[PDB]
């Protein structure tokens, strides 16, 4: 049983005398939402990824000592560059980027 529709809230910002915390919205008026009707080749495939990510993530947490873990996305960014660029690259392009031009 998969739900083709995904209604999501996202707490990211983007006004006059509104950024001030003393004037701005409270703790609940900070969310923006959207809608994903139909084209259920992405929503149901999205739900089939969080079920597989849980096994690795529950073991990633067991290793760490801290309570709150905000740095998973930054760690994947460093691993991105280190795999691409950490090793020596070649202009020939056997497995590395850098499109040759002459």
């Amino acid at each position: 049983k998969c739900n083709p529709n995904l209604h999501y809230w996202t707490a990211q910002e983007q006004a006059g005398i509104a950024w001030i915390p003393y004037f701005g919205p409270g703790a609940e008026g900070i969310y923006t939402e959207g809608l994903m009707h139909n084209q259920n080749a992405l929503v149901c495939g999205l739900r089939q990824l969080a079920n597989e990510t849980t096994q690795a993530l529950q073991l990633f947490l067991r290793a760490t000592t801290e309570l709150r873990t905000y740095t998973i996305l930054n760690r994947k960014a460093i691993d991105f560059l280190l795999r691409r660029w950490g090793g020596t690259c070649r202009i020939l392009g056997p497995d590395c980027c850098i499109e040759p031009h002459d």
Binding site: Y31, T53, T64, R68, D79
Partner: protein, 161 residues
């Protein structure tokens, strides 16, 4: 090891963090996202006396929490207040900075007394409990939560999900 999905032109590709190969551009950290999807969208049965059979108590595992950026519109949310037989709440109070689930359709409150073998209450299926942009492994008292799971994505130039 942790699967990472790449969303291009409304189409998902399950891949790793190393088998990306080239030409799948990652330009900024903005298009890295973590989404928390609810278990109620996977065909479960959600009553208040029939959902108490997917969590149970345990001692010896420290609690762990993890943050997510985007959540879903919960059809059901739960709010439990359970105390030991004499006077002590089983559920630890929420840590400083943990609030209820932002958007809930119908909340399910449950007071009352019940036995509690174990320090903390974990999920019996391996899923998280979703709080306000923070997913935990345990249950905190007096705070709305929904049971869900997290996914990690790379988006294309569209960065809305």
């Amino acid at each position: 090891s942790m699967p990472l999905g790449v969303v291009t032109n409304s189409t998902l590709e399950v891949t790793e963090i190393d088998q990306l190969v080239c030409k799948d551009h990652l330009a900024s950290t903005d298009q890295l996202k973590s989404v928390g999807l609810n278990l109620e969208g996977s065909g479960v049965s959600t009553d208040i006396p029939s959902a108490t059979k997917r969590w149970g108590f345990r001692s010896g595992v420290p609690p762990k929490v993890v943050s997510y950026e985007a959540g879903e519109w919960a059809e059901n949310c739960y709010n439990l207040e359970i105390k030991k037989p004499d006077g002590s709440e089983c559920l630890p109070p929420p840590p400083d900075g943990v609030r209820g689930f932002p958007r809930c359709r119908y909340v399910h409150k449950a007071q009352g007394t019940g036995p509690c073998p174990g320090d903390y209450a974990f999920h019996k299926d391996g899923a998280f409990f979703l709080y306000d942009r923070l997913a935990s492994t345990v249950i905190y008292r007096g705070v709305n939560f929904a049971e869900g799971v997290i996914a990690f994505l790379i988006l294309a130039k569209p960065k809305e999900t």
